[PDB]
Amino acid sequence: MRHYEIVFMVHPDQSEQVPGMIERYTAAITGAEGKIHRLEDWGRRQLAYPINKLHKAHYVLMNVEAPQEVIDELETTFRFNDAVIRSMVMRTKHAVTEAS
Amino acid sequence: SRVCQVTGKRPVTGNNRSHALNATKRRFLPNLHSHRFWVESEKRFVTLRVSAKGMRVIDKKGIDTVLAELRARGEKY
Amino acid sequence: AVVKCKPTSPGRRHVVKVVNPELHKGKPFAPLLEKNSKSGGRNNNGRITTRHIGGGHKQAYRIVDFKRNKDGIPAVVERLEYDPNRSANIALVLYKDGERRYILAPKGLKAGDQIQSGVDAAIKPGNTLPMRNIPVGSTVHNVEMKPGKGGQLARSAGTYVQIVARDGAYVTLRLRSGEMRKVEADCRATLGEVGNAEHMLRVLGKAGAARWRGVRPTVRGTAMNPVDHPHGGGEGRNFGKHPVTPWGVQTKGKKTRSNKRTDKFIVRRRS
Amino acid sequence: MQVILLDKVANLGSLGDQVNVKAGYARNFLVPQGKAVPATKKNIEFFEARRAELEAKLAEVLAAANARAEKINALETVTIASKAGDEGKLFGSIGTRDIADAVTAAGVEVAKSEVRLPNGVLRTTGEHEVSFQVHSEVFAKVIVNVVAE
RNA sequence: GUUUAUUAAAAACACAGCACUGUGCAAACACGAAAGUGGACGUAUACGGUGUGACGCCUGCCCGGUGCCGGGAGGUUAAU
C-alpha cells in the first residue's frame, strides 16, 4: 500500500475538535487496513505569514500507509469541511518514527 | 368598478385642457386602496377598498359608524 | 456526439445532428405525462401577442420535478429520456420507496448513479441541497429564487451558476449571463453543470427544421409598407431611420430594466 | 390625531394624555393591539373615573404576570442535543419552534412568538445567550446550551 | 418553398447561418382603462427585436452630425 505524510491545520477555536477529528479520520483509515504510524499532533504554533485574517492555526500530522480509495475520499473530507485549512498529502518511501 | 365604499366616490370625467385649450376627455380616478380595518365589534379585520378621504372619515367617525352606514345602504363589508 | 451529415440532397449540406447514444429508445413514462396544447402565439383576446410561433410537431408535456421535495431519501437515476420542452434531457429517478419522478439531468449523470435531495446529503454532482450548506465556489444548477419556489435559474443545457459569496443570510451568485445577484441561502440547488452542453453545436440545416420546431418566418421590417412597420417604404431599400420595434420603441441598445422591486437583489449588471 | 393612551408607549405615551400621534400610527399599531384609544371630547368622560383609577392596575396585573410568568422558571436553561453533521454544520437551524415546544414542555408555558433570538436562529452547536420578551420594560434570559449528538 | 384570388410568380418575401441589442423571471415585449392571458407550464445553450442572408476568402478609416449609453460636478428648470 502507499505511505503518505498528512500534515493539515485546524482553526484554533475549533482546536478542541482535534482529537475527535484525529480519531474519526484514523478510524476511517482503519476500515481500509491502513496501518497508522505517526500521530505527532504539533499543537498551536505561530504561523509565518497571515493565513486568513487570524494567524496561529493548529497543526496535525498523521502519516499513514493506506490504499487509494480511502486517501482520496479522506482528502475530500479535508476540502468540504470548515475546520481544516490547507491540508496536504505527500510521498511514500517507507514510514514511521519519532521525529520533528 | 372603482367605487370607494365609504364616500361613494367614482371616477368623474372631464376635459384635459392643454396649453392652447385643446380639450381631450380624461377620466379623474379616485385614490383607492385596499385597506384592512380592525373592528372590535367583530374583533377582527374587515377589509375595505376605500378612498383616502374615506380613511379620513374613518379617522373622524368610528369604524362602526361607517360599517353602520353600510349596514344602512346594505352593501357588504 | 456531434454528427456532421452528408450532402445527399441540398439542404443536407449544412446539417449537424447531436446523436446521443445514451438516451432512451422507447416511449416515455406515462404516469408523469400529459398533453400540451399549443397556442400559436395567442391569448384570451385571441390575438397574436407574441409573434412567430405556430405549427410544429405535437409534443406532450412531462411533469418534471424542480423543487426536489423527497427530502432524505436515496434515488437511483434509471434512464435518460429526451424531453421536447427543454434544451436538456430528463432523467427518470427511482426513489427507494418506489416513487418515480423526472429530474433535469446534470453533466455526469449516467444511469444507475445514486442522487439524493435534502439538507443531509453529499456534495456529489446531482444532489439537491440548500445554499447555506453548499460550499462557496461550488457550481450549482436548477437554482431557486424564493425558498420552496422550485427552481428558476440555470436550468437549460450546459447552463450553470457559480456560488460566489455568502453574505450573512444571502448568497451572491454569478449567473450564466454574468450578472451577480443575491438569493436567500435557504434555497435548494442541484450540483454540477447541466448536461447536454453540446446543444450549442446544432445547426438545423434547412427551413423545415425551424418550422417544425415551432418557429414561423420572421419578416424584416424593411420589406413592409410604412403603415405596417415603423421602418418600411422607400423605393429601392431606403432605410434612413433609427432602428426600432414594430411598436416604435427603440431597439438595438436601449435598456428596459425598470422594476425597482427587484433592484435589492442585484449586485452587478450584465456587461 | 389627538389620541389618549393605555400602554406606556416608550417615547411619549404616558397613560391617559392628549398625544399627537400620526394618522397611520394611531390606526395600524395602537388600535388593533389595543394600546391606545382615539379620544376626542367623549371618551374622556368615560375615562375619568371608570377607566383612570379602576382599570389601570386591572391592566397592570398583566404587567405583574411578566414578573410572575417570567419567574415560573428560576432554573433558566435549555438543552438542545440535535443531530449534528460530520463534525459541524448542524442539521437544522432553530427558530422560534424548538425552543417554544421545549420550554412549553419543560419550563414556562409561553406562546411561540415570544421566542427572541439575538445570535441568529441557532446554527452552530454550543452555548447561546438567548433572551425573551414578556414586557416592554422586563427582559428575561434563558441560556440555551446546544449539544452535539 | 412563398407571393399581388381576378393583367405582375420575379432579381421580390422567407430560409438555414452570422452579428448587434434588450430581457434575472411577478422577464422584456405584446393584447387588455382593469383583473388577467400570451411569452413558456420556458428560465440566458432561453426568449423578444432589428439588419444581413447558405458556403468560401473577408468585413478598412471617421464619434464632428442625428441616436443610444455611462457620468455626475457646474449652470438653467415644474408643481411646491
Side-chain angles (χ1 to χ4, degrees):
Chain A
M1 286 169 277
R2 299 282 194 275
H3 301 280
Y4 297 114
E5 288 195 356
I6 308 165
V7 186
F8 63 102
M9 293 186 275
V10 179
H11 187 77
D13 73 354
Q14 292 168 359
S15 66
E16 294 187 354
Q17 290 176 353
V18 167
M21 279 174 57
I22 292 173
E23 281 167 347
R24 182 176 175 87
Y25 288 164
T26 192
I29 294 171
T30 315
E33 281 83 1
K35 288 184 176 291
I36 200 74
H37 310 296
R38 304 290 295 152
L39 282 174
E40 195 180 7
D41 191 3
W42 283 359
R44 299 182 295 181
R45 56 187 292 170
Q46 180 177 5
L47 296 173
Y49 55 86
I51 297 177
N52 204 332
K53 212 93 298 176
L54 198 173
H55 320 272
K56 298 184 180 181
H58 179 83
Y59 289 10
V60 187
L61 166 51
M62 280 176 64
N63 197 352
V64 77
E65 180 187 7
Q68 298 169 356
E69 291 180 353
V70 151
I71 192 67
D72 284 334
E73 297 183 355
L74 209 155
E75 191 184 6
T76 62
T77 60
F78 287 124
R79 292 178 187 265
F80 290 154
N81 195 356
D82 286 332
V84 189
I85 306 168
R86 189 174 280 104
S87 63
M88 77 180 297
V89 179
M90 270 181 282
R91 291 184 180 179
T92 68
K93 292 180 183 179
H94 305 282
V96 319
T97 199
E98 293 286 325
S100 178
Chain B
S1 59
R2 292 193 177 99
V3 173
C4 172
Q5 282 302 117
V6 175
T7 57
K9 282 182 182 288
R10 65 180 181 176
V12 292
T13 51
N15 291 320
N16 191 5
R17 288 294 181 97
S18 72
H19 171 73
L21 288 172
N22 304 116
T24 311
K25 305 294 286 188
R26 48 87 52 85
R27 187 175 70 174
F28 289 99
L29 292 169
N31 186 358
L32 295 182
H33 183 270
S34 304
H35 191 269
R36 186 178 62 187
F37 283 111
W38 173 255
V39 178
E40 199 68 31
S41 177
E42 300 293 329
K43 294 179 182 178
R44 63 176 174 86
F45 297 103
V46 172
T47 304
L48 290 167
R49 186 178 183 181
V50 297
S51 64
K53 193 175 85 171
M55 297 175 70
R56 291 289 294 263
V57 170
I58 294 173
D59 199 71
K60 281 187 82 69
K61 301 176 185 179
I63 196 62
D64 193 74
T65 304
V66 172
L67 272 69
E69 296 183 1
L70 292 175
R71 188 181 183 274
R73 294 176 297 175
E75 300 294 329
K76 184 174 180 179
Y77 52 91
Chain C
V2 166
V3 172
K4 188 175 180 180
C5 293
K6 280 193 177 179
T8 67
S9 62
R12 295 283 295 184
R13 189 166 285 118
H14 308 294
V15 184
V16 171
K17 293 186 289 182
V18 184
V19 177
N20 196 358
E22 305 296 325
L23 289 169
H24 195 71
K25 297 179 182 180
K27 282 188 176 181
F29 183 70
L32 292 174
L33 193 72
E34 65 182 0
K35 71 175 182 181
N36 204 173
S37 67
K38 306 173 189 178
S39 67
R42 289 96 194 279
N43 60 355
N44 300 328
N45 303 124
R47 302 196 184 185
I48 173 164
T49 56
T50 299
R51 289 181 291 123
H52 317 307
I53 46 179
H57 188 276
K58 295 186 70 176
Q59 51 192 358
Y61 188 76
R62 275 76 167 168
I63 300 170
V64 178
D65 195 2
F66 294 115
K67 189 182 173 185
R68 295 286 297 272
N69 43 6
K70 297 304 287 180
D71 300 334
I73 295 171
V76 176
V77 175
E78 189 165 0
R79 67 190 178 186
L80 280 167
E81 294 187 351
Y82 169 71
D83 192 358
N85 300 117
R86 280 85 190 273
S87 62
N89 310 118
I90 50 175
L92 187 65
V93 162
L94 178 69
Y95 285 95
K96 183 63 180 174
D97 52 0
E99 178 174 357
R100 285 180 179 89
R101 288 185 176 182
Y102 283 117
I103 66 165
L104 286 172
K107 189 175 179 181
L109 188 67
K110 297 180 186 180
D113 293 329
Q114 189 178 2
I115 66 165
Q116 56 183 352
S117 62
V119 305
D120 200 2
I123 314 297
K124 183 181 179 179
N127 291 322
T128 289
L129 72 108
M131 283 178 189
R132 63 258 182 93
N133 299 116
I134 304 165
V136 179
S138 185
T139 295
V140 301
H141 66 276
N142 203 8
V143 176
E144 290 187 349
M145 287 292 294
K146 296 181 184 182
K149 179 58 172 290
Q152 304 283 317
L153 312 172
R155 37 184 277 171
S156 176
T159 301
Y160 62 93
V161 163
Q162 185 179 1
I163 290 173
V164 179
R166 183 170 178 268
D167 181 76
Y170 290 95
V171 170
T172 309
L173 297 178
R174 190 171 62 83
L175 291 169
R176 185 83 257 275
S177 60
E179 180 162 357
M180 300 288 286
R181 199 264 294 280
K182 291 183 181 181
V183 295
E184 184 67 31
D186 299 331
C187 296
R188 293 184 179 272
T190 302
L191 293 173
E193 297 185 354
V194 184
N196 201 7
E198 295 181 353
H199 179 65
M200 185 177 63
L201 296 173
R202 175 175 298 169
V203 300
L204 289 173
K206 63 183 186 178
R211 286 284 303 272
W212 61 65
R213 201 172 294 272
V215 182
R216 293 196 72 254
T218 301
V219 180
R220 292 178 290 119
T222 55
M224 305 184 181
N225 291 318
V227 68
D228 302 337
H229 205 275
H231 309 115
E235 288 296 327
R237 299 187 193 177
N238 295 323
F239 186 74
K241 301 182 187 69
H242 304 283
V244 289
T245 55
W247 295 273
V249 176
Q250 175 72 40
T251 188
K252 199 185 265 83
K254 186 258 178 293
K255 301 185 172 70
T256 59
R257 179 57 172 77
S258 178
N259 201 2
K260 290 180 185 177
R261 171 180 57 84
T262 60
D263 284 334
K264 182 179 183 293
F265 301 100
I266 282 175
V267 177
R268 292 292 179 270
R269 290 290 295 272
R270 182 179 70 251
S271 178
Chain D
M1 291 294 287
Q2 299 293 325
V3 169
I4 208 163
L5 281 94
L6 306 172
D7 191 6
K8 308 294 286 191
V9 169
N11 189 6
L12 40 85
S14 58
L15 188 59
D17 284 330
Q18 290 180 355
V19 167
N20 193 2
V21 298
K22 296 172 177 62
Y25 183 65
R27 189 165 63 237
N28 298 321
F29 193 70
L30 297 178
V31 165
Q33 299 165 358
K35 299 296 182 182
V37 174
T40 302
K41 298 292 185 181
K42 288 179 181 180
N43 280 326
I44 304 161
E45 296 177 352
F46 293 154
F47 193 74
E48 182 180 3
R50 298 179 178 178
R51 298 178 191 182
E53 295 178 354
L54 180 68
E55 297 181 356
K57 298 177 183 179
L58 294 172
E60 197 171 359
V61 293
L62 292 173
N66 292 320
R68 296 183 180 181
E70 178 191 7
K71 295 178 181 179
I72 295 173
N73 194 3
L75 296 173
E76 293 175 352
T77 183
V78 168
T79 297
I80 295 168
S82 175
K83 181 62 66 68
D86 291 331
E87 287 88 7
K89 300 295 182 183
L90 186 64
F91 180 77
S93 296
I94 297 98
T96 66
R97 293 156 188 178
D98 197 1
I99 301 168
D101 288 331
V103 173
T104 302
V108 172
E109 188 179 2
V110 72
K112 182 177 71 67
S113 68
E114 287 83 1
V115 177
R116 293 292 186 269
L117 290 172
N119 194 0
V121 289
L122 298 180
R123 276 79 177 271
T124 303
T125 293
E127 186 177 1
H128 294 284
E129 181 177 1
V130 170
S131 296
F132 289 159
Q133 284 180 356
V134 288
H135 200 270
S136 65
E137 294 179 354
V138 182
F139 293 103
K141 289 179 182 179
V142 174
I143 303 299
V144 180
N145 200 3
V146 182
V147 184
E149 184 178 2

